[PDB]
Amino acid sequence: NISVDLETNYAELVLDVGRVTLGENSRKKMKDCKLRKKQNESVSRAMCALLNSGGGVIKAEIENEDYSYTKDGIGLDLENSFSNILLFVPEYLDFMQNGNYFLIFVKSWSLNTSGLRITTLSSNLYKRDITSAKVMNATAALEFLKDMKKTRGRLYLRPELLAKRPCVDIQEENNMKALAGVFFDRTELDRKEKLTFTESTHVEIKNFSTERLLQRIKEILPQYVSAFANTDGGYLFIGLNEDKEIIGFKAEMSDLDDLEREIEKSIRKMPVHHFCMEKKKINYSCKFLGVYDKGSLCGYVCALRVERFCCAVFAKEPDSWHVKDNRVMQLTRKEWIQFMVEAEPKFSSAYEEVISQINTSLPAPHSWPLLEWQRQRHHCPGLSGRITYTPENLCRKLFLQHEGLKQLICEEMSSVRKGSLIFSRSWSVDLGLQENHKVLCDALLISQDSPPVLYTFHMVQDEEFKGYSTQTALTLKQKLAKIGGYTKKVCVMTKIFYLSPEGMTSCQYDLRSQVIYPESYYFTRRKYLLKALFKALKRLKSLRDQFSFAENLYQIIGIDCFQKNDK
Amino acid sequence: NISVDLETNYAELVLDVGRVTLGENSRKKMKDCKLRKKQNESVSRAMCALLNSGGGVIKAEIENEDYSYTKDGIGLDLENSFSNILLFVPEYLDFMQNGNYFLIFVKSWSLNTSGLRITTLSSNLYKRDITSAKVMNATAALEFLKDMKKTRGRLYLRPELLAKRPCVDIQEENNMKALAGVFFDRTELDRKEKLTFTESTHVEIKNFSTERLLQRIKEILPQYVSAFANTDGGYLFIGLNEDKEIIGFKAEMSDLDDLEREIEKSIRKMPVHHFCMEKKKINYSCKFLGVYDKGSLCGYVCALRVERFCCAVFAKEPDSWHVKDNRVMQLTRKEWIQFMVEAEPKFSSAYEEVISQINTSLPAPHSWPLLEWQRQRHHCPGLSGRITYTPENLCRKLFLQHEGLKQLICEEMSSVRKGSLIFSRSWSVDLGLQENHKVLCDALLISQDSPPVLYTFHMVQDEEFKGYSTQTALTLKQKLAKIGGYTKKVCVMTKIFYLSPEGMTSCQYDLRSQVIYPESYYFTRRKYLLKALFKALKRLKSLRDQFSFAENLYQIIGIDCFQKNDK
Amino acid sequence: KPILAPEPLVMDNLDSIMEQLNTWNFPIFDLVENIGRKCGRILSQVSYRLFEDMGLFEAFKIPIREFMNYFHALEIGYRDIPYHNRIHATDVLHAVWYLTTQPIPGLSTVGYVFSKTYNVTDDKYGCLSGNIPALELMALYVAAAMHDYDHPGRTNAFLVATSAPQAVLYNDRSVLENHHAAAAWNLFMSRPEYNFLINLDHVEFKHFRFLVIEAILATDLKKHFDFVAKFNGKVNDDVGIDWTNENDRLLVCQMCIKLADINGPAKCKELHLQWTDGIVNEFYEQGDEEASLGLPISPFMDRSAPQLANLQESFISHIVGPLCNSYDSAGLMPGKWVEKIYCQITQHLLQNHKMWKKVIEEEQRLAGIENQ
Amino acid sequence: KPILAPEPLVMDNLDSIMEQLNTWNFPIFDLVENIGRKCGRILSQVSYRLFEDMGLFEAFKIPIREFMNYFHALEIGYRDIPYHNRIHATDVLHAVWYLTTQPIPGLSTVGYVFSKTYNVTDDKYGCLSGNIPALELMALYVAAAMHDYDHPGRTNAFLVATSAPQAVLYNDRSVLENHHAAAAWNLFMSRPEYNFLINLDHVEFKHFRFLVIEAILATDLKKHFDFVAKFNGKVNDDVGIDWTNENDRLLVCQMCIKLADINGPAKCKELHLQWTDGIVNEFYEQGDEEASLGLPISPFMDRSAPQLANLQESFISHIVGPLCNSYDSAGLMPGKWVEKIYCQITQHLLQNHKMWKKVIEEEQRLAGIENQ
Ligand SMILES: O=C1CN2Cc3c(ccc(Cl)c3Cl)N=C2N1
Ligand SMILES: O=C1CN2Cc3c(ccc(Cl)c3Cl)N=C2N1
Ligand SMILES: [Mg+2]
Ligand SMILES: [Mg+2]
Ligand SMILES: [Mg+2]
Ligand SMILES: [Mg+2]
Ligand SMILES: [Zn+2]
Ligand SMILES: [Zn+2]
Description:
Largest sheet of chain C: 2 strands, antiparallel
Bound molecules: ligand J33, magnesium ion, zinc ion
Number of domains of chain C: 1
CATH class of chain C: Mainly Alpha
Largest interface: A-B, 80 and 81 residues
Shape of chain A: elongated
Largest sheet of chain A: 5 strands, mixed
Oligomer: heterotetramer
Number of helices of chain C: 15
Number of strands of chain A: 19
Shape of chain C: globular
Strand content of chain C: under 5%
Strand content of chain A: 5-15%
Radius of gyration of chain C: 21 Å
Number of domains of chain A: 3
Strand order of the largest sheet of chain C: 1-2
Radius of gyration of chain A: 32 Å
CATH superfamily of chain C: 3'5'-cyclic nucleotide phosphodiesterase, catalytic domain
């Protein structure tokens, strides 16, 4: 399986896909097709699970001995899978081999123009084309399910009337449908006879010259049942050949009942999801016909009729994954369709609209940003006004006591052009997490370069606090990308400090000189991170004092609070 | 080519794709691959041109002698093309063979959740995957172009800094990029030497063991140039083999200049479309390298470096068609990107919002529809109040004179459960068309069943008025589906009447008993047709008096006019 | 000097008639004639009954004497005109009370207060008191009680046409509703014995005032289709109705009083006929004044050429129709199951609309016969 | 009896000073002291100059005597307070005139009227008169002239706090702006000699009144961020500005007068310092009254603990900043090319904001030094 590697110093979800061969020539000349398919499937499961739940990193042990990636590449099956799950590969993926490990860094999935909110390896909703039963891609499945959810069902025009059309010899698909309807009730079939009709959007034909035929039906039937029930219903005949010569399959009695039993079991196992008031079942019906050559029974021809359905019909559960807490799971059907059908709330009051739309930033100065404001404009004596210590009361009080803290913050904030750190009594509880009381305070430095850092301060010379800080940084990264709507690659770095009285030093940990990321994770944008942090705190209902925008002028003018369902 | 058949009695655009073979076995055993590809391409051009411009009908002469379609089907190449251009085939297409002609009825393209506003056979915007240069589908091309139009360019992070990462032996794609960068400036190449790098998202390698090599480059180069310029730039080496053994191609002097000339011509012919202020060109550069075996020149290796571009780069014009007036044309590049980038206006004032949202119609009565109202509730003495003669002043005046008209309208409106005909001084001018003064008036019967009819009345015993009426019905159908937003299949039938004084009869034409449509065109919905007609008249700025909603109560209450930029 | 009150607070001859107050077709004119029509203290009595039912005289400790003082001063405030008088305000108060404290099939409830009786026994019946705190409902009731205060008898468009001082004073933007709320609140704050909100908090009273003024301003017929479209878009594609939202609760009370003020064509035939008689008389008065000032007479407002049935049919089709549709499609209309669901209100509406369609058809038929 | 006019209509000692009226930094206080400050007829004179420039005395045939009558009555109407007085109204009138009749780089023009001078020679310079008919601009100018009429000297939140009669009378919803428009229009319609709109149509006058009242109601600071967000969404993702729309032209004039009423921090340093002195004096008056009524004193409104620079910096950053940004990003701010473009207004804004940031920094530094 796929296990969340809890033994990494990365501030991210790491998934361990087991051993994995790599390289185009090493994959091509791999003499085990089932193993290769299984490895490709494991990597694709990992990548979908990462995309659906914030970011993440996939760690694969290189199976071949001497692997380079600089004269070997990755492969071609994996590249096909990658290019299928995503539209653009360079925008989401980064590959980096770390000695004897191949790491794939995965950006988090973002809402785009397509409208999709989660990625799926396969919807498993088949649709019947003119002739072939194909599987709905992501976009077609979205469109299908949303049209159905709109009408609270699936609109049909059950036989109220045959339209009064002119009399004229004309040929249409309903001709084939009707000829199948007459074929279906025939009580006997003459062996090696011709057919009057071919296969179309309502008619399918299968040879299946198989001695067993049951292991084959058990795996091929549900996709055709879904293809039919998802469009107009239809018939599926077995025992014919390509040249439309009825032959049937050589089946003796005492097996036709077994075959029918397996068919009923298979079609009752297929999932289904209703948007209508009642909740029907898949109305269908099987039948068998003799193929008597001249006076004797040569065999049978199993004819199955499937009626058009009122809501969607799956062949299996939708192929969509996600890591909940650990042990990456598969999205249930109900959750999957809620992600495919519902919209995002997207309230965006007028005050928030202007607070964000300050972030247009055309090729022009566009001064006056509101998310970078402060009353107390005198911190850190030798410096300019280039750092907004935001809470402004938590920071002041934390600077009053813990005298070494202010000096440490000054000696830290020296090499930063422009940034804005945000303190907190504890950031773990501001992200909906378990607080541990030994953590003095926190911070969040968000500068132009140098991706954001989560300082954790404490005065306890017994523990290490690596687990706490890394969990908090991970959760902040995921919350940013999944709720703040930040649409770029991010890493939330870490630093830990000890703060014994009479001494402010001893950085017990520095996550930046411990782990390497691709070249692109090191360039944040610092205004969209602010928008993302604002929206994340708002959506988590923990936005209290960060982003001052002082109200003493608002109270004079008559403008009300920022936003809530409280007035 | 493809010619608009002006010689049909259909109220639609008919396209003539020339002779066309049909049937799966007739297509498969067709001993002319170029001809088969050409026929498939002609049909696909016709179908895209129909989808992009309202509805239409494709008429194909059956090429094989004895063709049935009821034991032959269509084919498989055509089915593949159909299923590619559309998501769902049964929703848009109907096939109907009419003796020695195969007619394909095409619904009009509609805005769906995907966001696409026009269909394209191929965007011709290639993207570079991990290894292969693929062509952007419709959705990826939409996303790409909209992201670019948003930032008014295409955002890069030109070398401001190499991030301060730890020192550790690590392998990445930039390794291959740099090794290519050192390969590119090498002044000479030793024949039959090994390579240190393989092909990735920045590196491509081609064998091309071709005596000419120029007819091949001329056709294969632009798609790789586009794949590179549309993602991160890169290098393209020719003269190598699969096993990474430099061999080169046996080229003598006096041809390398020709090859470079053809390359520059080819890359300057490739279209491009900028969303940035300046308008650069495709910055690139070629080069040739010797492959001297031991003291002699065995050949060359043409190395081409392409730099990442600021806006989109096509291999050819986008493959999108439309019929303008006649002689179905191809959408220019500018129009194509305006259809891919811009949104629809979608004003929808509050009054219109409620006038439409009366059309929810859950499984419940939901009486009180506003688009079916009238003051004068006494027409046609023997009848109920089941027909809304809408203009109410044009209809009254037209009933005052032309005494046989009212009796004719009564004898016509007898067999209709519930409908609403809408008169007009001339419907041709209400759709932006040329009026002919011999047409007395018009009408538009929109009932539950019996698809809408366009009565044309006149008193002139010389002409026929078939051309006028059919043009008007065609234009009304197209305007409904393309501007009113009606999302189902429609045909606008026709009827013509002569109205000499002292006699009201002589229906000179009845389009319903002249032409056959599929079984589904005969079931309209009559409330969405009303919404569509309202929106079409609004968008055409001809909405004057139809849909009464009398204002004498509005003027009392204080509510203003329906909607316009006039108050 | 101030309008204080009548001597015994709760008169008791109108007992056994308020018992039939849990019925949608409250015989209001019967109570009017029963009560001394000489003076008119109907609004105060019905308000006392409703507030005792909700129990707001303990849910907020409102001293009943000052309450009666204020509301008798209010009912004295209402002018003596054909339609917009204190009987109409009692109508609207009873309508909102019924709509918010009578069983609603398929409503899931969660300080709140329920009606006196209400028969709470099942789960398939909710009431709007089980989703809206007591403060919001008290605000809504007092908004309904004082919502047409000191009505001049003319419409907004008339005051805007003649440029009346109430039109200049309020900038021609919902003249009448601003006037009603302004005058009512002015009269409230004038005396000290009117403060029946004496045991409230500063913030509580602020919120109460805000809700009352919003409710009264919701009944401006110009902003009708806007409210309908907003209530459609907030029940159709959204998550439905998140009752924890204050915006949702505010919009629901606004729609409720919108539906209550226009409820002539939702009662039995005789009640609706009486209300229509009143409204036609008032329009006739206004048209009478309008022809004298030289202005072209208004549509429907000519007693010498009446088009009463035209007016009532168009009204029921355009105004009350879509409003009741949007109010019902959100599953808030009070009704009962059928052992699918029976709603008295929309049935009355359909019956009356059909009746006016009969009158229109017959009149046009006879006129076309006679006048050829 | 009515305020009629001063004897000679257009006084002429203030010649050669109105010539420097096509400059953004009009020395308004110099003209104030030049004119007899005993009486005060500045508003009338500047209005006559501006209307003669636009030529509206022939574009609408407005009799100049009744014009001067009305506007002198108006300037008499303005109370004598530190900030919101007739000098402020003359300021705002001149600001809107400059913003709509001075060259705007990159504006494509199309009955219209242009400024007197304007130097129309190129195509790369447009003016707002070349996109807005004469009626809309006359409405906008008269809206600016009477937009703070009879100002009590307090703010909206104060009148709402103490429950002033102007607060009850208007339901606590933009009390002051409704009062300004109401009182001004009342005074206009009072006498017959004030009708300087005598040669208009019924519909013309109706539209004019609508636009004037909308313009005056736009200057309510509570509705500031709403206007900014609406103007952002209508220039950002849309087709831009379809000037044929009346909604677009209305919204543009609303934003223009919004920007004009707050234009202290967009002039030279001394002018802005004078306006700030006025506004701080007015806030000090209001705080003085507020401490006497027992209410907790308002922020920034304590002359015994002034935070003037705090107020001005926060104001420039929060109010005038985003407004000028949204107004400029739509390419309407008047400026000049650079043989890319130089805009005087935003430069003045940046300079003043930096100055107040100096004062804040120095004060906090000194206080942290002294108080440890
Ligand atoms: O039964 C009834 C009650 N009402 C009220 C009403 C109206 C038409 C206009 C207005 Cl403004 C009003 Cl309040 N029609 C009816 N009919
Ligand atoms: O130069 C100036 C001019 N003004 C006006 C002003 C203000 C703060 C509040 C209000 Cl309400 C107003 Cl009108 N600050 C400044 N500063
Ligand atoms: Mg009212
Ligand atoms: Mg009322
Ligand atoms: Mg003001
Ligand atoms: Mg002002
Ligand atoms: Zn279903
Ligand atoms: Zn470009």
